[PDB]
Design a binder for this molecule. Structure first.
Ligand SMILES: Fc1cc(F)c(F)c(F)c1F
Ligand SMILES: [Cl-]
Length: 164
């Protein structure tokens, strides 16, 4: 298991434009295209992302290309953020994956309200951190995925992704 396999489980793979859990146009392995309700706006973003006139469908290779870029972008986002970097630096590699997972799903602005969770994670108060993380819109809207991510933070193991 690793961040790539982990996110592949959580996001799936779809080669045609679809709507994510929030109703937003998305493609590939959870690549958000736009928050606009316009499908044309979404296709435009797709073309711009891929570098060709696609009209809504990409190849697996193209999906994986965007996926690698997105994982990269999440890591870079964490490292450039003064609040996130120290917590991330403090974690072992498994829990780092859990962190990247969160940022991939909700962005830096989504993780902004997680100050107290972040403090607990840096203190390595795993059970307390896990409880705090579940007290969120994130957990309530996507409980099964949040549960997996939280278990990863709680245990520092890949147990929640085994048999998946
Ligand atoms: F973005 C992040 C989200 C988390 F839940 C973290 F623990 C973290 F270190 C981090 F950088
Ligand atoms: Cl389409």
């Amino acid at each position: 298991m690793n961040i790539f396999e982990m996110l592949r489980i959580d996001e799936g793979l779809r080669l045609k434009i679809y709507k994510d859990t929030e109703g937003y146009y998305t493609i590939g392995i959870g690549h958000l295209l736009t928050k606009s309700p316009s499908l044309n706006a979404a296709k435009s973003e797709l073309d711009k992302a891929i570098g060709r006139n696609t009209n809504g469908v990409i190849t697996k290779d193209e999906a994986e290309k965007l996926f690698n870029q997105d994982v990269d972008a999440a890591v870079r986002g964490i490292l450039r953020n003064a609040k996130l970097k120290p917590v991330y630096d403090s974690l072992d590699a498994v829990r780092r994956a859990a962190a990247i997972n969160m940022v991939f799903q909700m962005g830096e602005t989504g993780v902004a309200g997680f100050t107290n969770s972040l403090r607990m994670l840096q203190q390595k108060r795993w059970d307390e951190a896990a409880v705090n993380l579940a007290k969120s819109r994130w957990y309530n809207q996507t409980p099964n995925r949040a549960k997996r991510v939280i278990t990863t933070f709680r245990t520092g193991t890949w147990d929640a992704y085994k048999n998946l």
